[model samples]
Target: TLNGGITDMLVELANFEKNVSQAIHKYNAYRKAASVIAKYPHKIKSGAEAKKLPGVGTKIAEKIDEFLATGKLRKLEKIRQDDTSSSINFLTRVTGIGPSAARKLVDEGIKTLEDLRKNEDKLNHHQRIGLKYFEDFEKRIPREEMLQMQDIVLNEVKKLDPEYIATVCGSFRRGAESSGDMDVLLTHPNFTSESSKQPKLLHRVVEQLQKVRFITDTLSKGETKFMGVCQLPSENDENEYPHRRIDIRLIPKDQYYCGVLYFTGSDIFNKNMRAHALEKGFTINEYTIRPLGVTGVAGEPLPVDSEQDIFDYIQWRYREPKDRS
Candidate 1:
C-alpha cells in the first residue's frame, strides 16, 4: 500500500533542503530513510519505527517527528536566512562544483555570477568551462540529446580503433529521463597486452573531436582519461549548443567490467557497496579491488578480466545495466 502522506512529506523536505543550502549528503539521507519507510510492509506508525532503517539515525528520526507533527524542520529555516547560502546553492547546480567547492566560493565572497566571472583564475579548467555553460549544463540533457551525444563519441571512437569497445555508463545507461553528465567507458579486447598502447586511442579521438570543435575546454586530458565539455548539434540551428560535461575513461579490457560497475551507479549505492567491500576484507575503488592484508595494508588488485570476476570477488549478485538503479 502506498503511504501518500509520508511520500509527500519527504518530497517537500527534499525541496526545503535544496532551497536552504543544506548539504546534499543530509538531503540524500532523508530521501533514503523516507524510501525505506515508505516500503515497510506495515506502516511506520511513528518516528521510532522509522528509525530502524539502516541509514536513519537520531537526527533524521527527530526531523521525521517534526514533519509528522508541525510539518517543518527549523534547521532548514535557519539556512534560508543567509543570502550567501542560496547563492552557493545556485553555483553548485553547475556540474563541476560539489558542496565543498560551493562553500569555498561562499567564503571567498563570490556570491553572484559576476563574482565568479571576476575570479576566473581561481577556477580549474573544468570549473572555468563549467561556469561558461552554467545555464546549459544546469538544464537536464534530454534523452534524445544524450543519445545524439553518445553517437557522436561512438563514431569517433570507432574510427580511432575499430576493435575498441565503448559503453555509456552512468545515468544514461540507467534509463534516466535526463542526465547531469556523461561517462564513457572505453576498452580494447586485448586490453591487458595492449594496455600500454591505449593512450593513443584516447588522444586520437580527443584530437579529432577538438579539430571539429565538438569538444571545447580541455579540463584534464591524460593518458587514460579525458574530462572536458562537448556540445551536440541543435535541431533547428547550425551552431552547436553550449558544451555539456563529459568524462571519458580508458581501461584495460580486463578491467572494463569493474569500470562499468563503478561508473554505472547511484552514488549512494556505490558508497554502500564500497563500505560493504571494506567490511568483507577488500578495498574497492574506481580502478580496481585490492584485498586487505594482515597488516591492514591493501594487497594488489586481484585478477579481474571480466565484470563477472568483479561481482564474484565482491560476493554480489551480477546485475545487468538496467538493474543498477
Candidate 2:
C-alpha cells in the first residue's frame, strides 16, 4: 500500500513558505528535510532508519514518525493557532511594514483593519499611506495601464518643466508584464548647479498634477521625493475604480545614476552590487558616492556632475536607461 503521510507532510511544508510567510530559513529546513526523506531510495521501515539520513536529526526523525502514526506535525498546528504570530505573519504582506514592524503593530493591539484605522497615529507617513491603499495597491498593475500611466507622467513632466527629464524605472523598466508599483525619476541638466533652484521643479510638477485630481493622497512629500496615490481616467465607471501606488523622486542630476541603479532593482541584484561596491573600497548610496577611509568613515561625497562619474567611481560599464533592466 502507498503511504500518503509523507506526501501530506511535504505539502504542508511547501504551504508554510508559499502561504504562511515563514522565514526562508524555516522553509529551506523543511525542504531539506523533505528531500532527505524523499530520496531514501526506499521507505523507512522504522524511526531509527529515518534518523540516519544525512540531514535528518533526532527531532525531525521523531516528526517523521509522528506523521507516520498521526498524519500531522503538532508544531505546525501550534504555529497556526497562535493569534499574535499569525497576525504578524499576515501584516507583513502589507507594503512598508517588515517583520519587526509587524510585530510592533501586533504588540500595540492592532490586528485588524479597524484596529489600524483607530490607531492611525501609530503609523509613519509611508505606513499610513500604504494602509490607505492596502487593497488597491495589492493588485498588480496591468502592462497597458502601466504604459498609460507612463505616458501621462511624461507628458505632465513636459508641461510643468520642459527642461526636466523623466523616466519610469521599476518592474516596468524591467519589461515585466505587470508591476507592483510605479517609480518615476526626474532630473534636469541645469540641476547640476547647486544655485540653480532645481528642487522646485519637482515640487511644481507635483503641485500642477494635484490640481487636476490625478493625484489623490500624498503619503509623504519631501524636498526630493513624493510618494502618493494616483488614479487614471476610467473608461466608464468614475468613483468605483481603485487608485494605484505611484512613487515620484526628484534626484539631483549628480546622483541620478545611483538613484536609477537603486530603484531599478531586482533586489537581489541591488544587494550584490552594493556588496561589490563595498569590496572595491567605495560606498554607494542613493544620494551620493563616497570612498572608504582608513577609519572606516566615508570621505567627502564625490562631485558627480554626470551619470558617467558614478559609473567610473563604481567601475561599472555605463548602462543606458532602457538597458538597465
Candidate 3:
C-alpha cells in the first residue's frame, strides 16, 4: 500500500469494483479519484491530502485511510463475499449472457448447472450454448493440446493452399505451459489489402476449414480476418476437447513480420521493443515497420517475411517465440 503511489491504489480499487462487484458508481468514483491522483505528480501521504483532489471526498478519503491502515479494504471483501452469486455472475462472463439476463437468472434462483437444466425454457439459443460450453470455455488447454490444435490448423489449411502462412502466436507460441485458446494468423505473399484477389484467399481458407467441421462458430468474418470458436472432434463419447477461441488474420507480406512480432509478445517485452523502435527514429506496429520521416511522420513500410526480419530491421538479435516468454 505504501510502495505504489495513491494513484496505483485507487486504480486497483477501481478494477476490483469493476471486475468482482456491481458497484458501478463506486467504480466510477474510484476511477475519477485515480485520474485526479495520477495527474498530481506526487506520492500522497494522507487522506487529507487526497481530499483536496476534486473527486476524493468522504467515501474516497475514508477508503484511503482504511487502506493505509490495514493495506486492505474490508468493504471490498464484504461485498465480494455477500455477492453469493458467483455462479450466476460467471454466466454473465460467458459469450451470450448480459448483466440483465444473468441477473435475471439469479433473481429466479438459478445458481447451478442443474438449475439451468431445469429452467431450460428460460434461455435463448445463444445463452443455452454459452451455458452448455461454460466449463469447456473456462478450461486451460494443456500445452500438449495446444500443439495438437496447432497441427490441426496447419494440416487443415494446407489443403486449400499450401502457399499460405499461419502461426499459433499467443502464449502457446511464447511457450506457456498452458493456454486458453488458439491464436492463428494467416498471410500469403499474394494477399495484400490492395489486391482484390488476395482478400478472397483469406475466406477461402476459412471456408475449407469450415467444410471439414473444424471451425465450430463464426464470431466475425472480414475480408482479411476470421474470428471464431473451434473444437477437436471427439475420438469417442468418453472424452472431447473444449471449444477454444480462434483468430485467423490475413496480414499483407509487408506487414506480416511486424504482426508476428507484436502478437508473439509477452506484453512487457513488446512495450520495451516499441520504445526502443521509437528511440531509433522508427515506428513499429502490427501493420508494418517504417522509418520516421523528417517532419516526424512515418514513412511507408519496409519489406518483411519471417519474424526475424522485424528484429533485423530494429538492429536487435531475433528471439525465438519460445524464448519470448
Q: Largest TM-score belongs to which candidate?
A: 3
Instruction: Sort the candidates on TM-score, descending order.
Output: 3, 2, 1
lDDT of 3 by residue, 1-325 (tens): 3326556667767877877666887889888888777777777777777678787888788877777778777766666544647656666756667778878888667756667777768887666766667778778989987887888889888877788888878888888998877888778878674655466777887887778787887766777777777877778766567787778888876677778778878898898888888887788888888898876799988777677777887788987778765
Instruction: Determine which window of 10 residues in candidate 1 has minimal summed lDDT.
Output: 189-198
Q: After superposition, how far is residue 7 of candidate 3 from its true place, in Å?
A: 22
Number of colliding residue pairs in each model: 0, 0, 0
Name the runs in model 2 displaced over 4 angstroms: 1-83, 95-105, 113-129, 188-199, 238-241, 278-281, 291-308, 319-325
lDDT of 2 at 108: 73
In the predicted model 2, the residue pairs found to clash are: none
- Each prediction's Cα lDDT score? 0.77, 0.77, 0.77
Error of 2 at 262 (Å): 1.9
lDDT of 1 by residue, 131-172 (tens): 887787767788788898888888988887799888898889
TM-score, model 2 to reference: 0.65
